[PDB]
Design an enzyme around this catalytic site. Structure first.
Site, PDB file in Angstrom:
ATOM      1  N   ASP A 247       0.857  -1.125   0.214  1.00 56.60           N
ATOM      2  CA  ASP A 247       0.117   0.049   0.035  1.00 56.60           C
ATOM      3  C   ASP A 247       0.810   1.542  -0.016  1.00 56.60           C
ATOM      4  OD1 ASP A 247      -1.904   2.112   0.917  1.00 56.60           O
ATOM      5  OD2 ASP A 247      -3.240   0.188   1.187  1.00 56.60           O
TER       6      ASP A 247
ATOM      7  N   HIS B 233      -3.285   6.102   4.200  1.00 60.49           N
ATOM      8  CA  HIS B 233      -3.891   4.562   3.830  1.00 60.49           C
ATOM      9  C   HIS B 233      -3.234   3.329   4.338  1.00 60.49           C
ATOM     10  CE1 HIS B 233      -6.979   2.673   1.170  1.00 60.49           C
ATOM     11  NE2 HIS B 233      -5.895   1.861   1.280  1.00 60.49           N
TER      12      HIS B 233
ATOM     13  N   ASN C 222     -14.060  -0.032  -5.471  1.00 59.85           N
ATOM     14  CA  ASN C 222     -15.128   0.698  -4.786  1.00 59.85           C
ATOM     15  C   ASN C 222     -15.914   1.408  -5.979  1.00 59.85           C
ATOM     16  OD1 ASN C 222     -14.014   0.100  -2.219  1.00 59.85           O
ATOM     17  ND2 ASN C 222     -12.661   1.712  -2.659  1.00 59.85           N
TER      18      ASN C 222
ATOM     19  N   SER D 233     -11.006  -1.511   0.684  1.00 61.38           N
ATOM     20  CA  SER D 233      -9.710  -1.520   1.135  1.00 61.38           C
ATOM     21  C   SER D 233      -9.565  -1.537   2.786  1.00 61.38           C
ATOM     22  CB  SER D 233      -8.826  -0.092   0.480  1.00 61.38           C
ATOM     23  OG  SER D 233      -7.940   0.470   1.423  1.00 61.38           O
TER      24      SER D 233
END
Ligand SMILES: [Ca+2]
Length: 279
Positions: free
Chosen positions: A39, A69, A161, A224
């Site tokens: 990530d 994130h 998403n 996520s």
């Protein structure tokens, strides 16, 4: 063990029904397992990780998480307060820049990195990877996730998403890895969650409280956020000896809460991750 007033997603994961707020889990807590978070990196110094997080790789000028994130995801895997597997080792691979973007080539390199790098870590109970990222279909990206999985790493990846069929996204569409959809605290499919025959499981993905950069916390939403719940759960179950990297996704789907989610489109699984812990 029992963590009272836990984030709703942790409670949900140890419950047969929505609407409770205590997380129950075996005290082994993922001890002796490892999870790679692939990530924007991890702020390892956050007190919530307690010395158990480390950056092992970056493709950029810094290995620090300048976004938040990856740190949020890492916290859901294994922070003491916000994590599913409160005793796992956390390894950060920064394939996304501080804007949360990464080229496909970099992302693929990061997957192959973990597939080798796990031979350099001590993980007697097993190894997991959480991939909260995605983009358009690419057979090269899929194939890379398939290699990671085949090398003996339980791979969990975000469905995406887009509120769309995940067959059109990578690595979401790769059949051999665990593709994870997002649900909310009322057991509805998250409104942004992708869906489709390629999904393996759902986890908590809406309004998820976890660690952030600058030593803080925040609530955010996404497949996520669901992904690290499933990754944390696989690590926890592996330390319990219940399953292995090769079969954890299957085991999780077999032991899930079934038929409890609403707004699941026809032909997508109605399965919600569940740790089957009898306190
Ligand atoms: Ca899959």
């Amino acid at each position: 063990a029992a963590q009272t007033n836990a984030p709703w997603g942790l409670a949900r994961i140890s419950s047969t029904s929505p609407g409770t707020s205590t997380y129950y889990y075996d005290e082994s807590a993922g001890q002796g397992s490892c999870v790679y978070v692939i990530d924007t990196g991890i702020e390892a110094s956050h007190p919530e990780f307690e010395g158990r997080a480390q950056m092992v790789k970056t493709y950029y000028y810094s290995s620090r998480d300048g976004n938040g994130h990856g740190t949020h995801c890492a916290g859901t895997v294994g922070s003491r307060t916000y994590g599913v597997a409160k005793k796992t080792q956390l390894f950060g691979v920064k394939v996304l820049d501080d804007n949360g973007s990464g080229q496909y080539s970099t992302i693929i390199a990061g997957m192959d990195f973990v597939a080798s790098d796990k031979n350099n870590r001590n993980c007697p109970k097993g190894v997991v990877a959480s991939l909260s990222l995605g983009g358009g279909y690419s057979s090269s990206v899929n194939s890379a996730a398939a290699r990671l999985q085949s090398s003996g790493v339980m791979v969990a990846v975000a469905a995406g998403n887009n509120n769309a069929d995940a067959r059109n996204y990578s690595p979401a569409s790769e059949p051999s890895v665990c593709t994870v959809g997002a649900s909310d605290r009322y057991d509805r499919r998250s409104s942004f969650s992708n869906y489709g025959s390629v999904l393996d499981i759902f986890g908590p993905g809406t309004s998820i409280l976890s660690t952030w950069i600058g030593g803080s916390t925040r609530s955010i939403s996404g497949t996520s956020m669901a992904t690290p719940h499933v990754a944390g759960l696989a690590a926890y179950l592996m330390t319990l000896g219940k399953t292995t990297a090769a079969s954890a996704c299957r085991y999780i789907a077999d032991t899930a809460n079934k038929g409890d989610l609403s707004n699941i489109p026809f032909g997508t699984v109605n399965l919600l991750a569940y740790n089957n812990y009898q306190a």
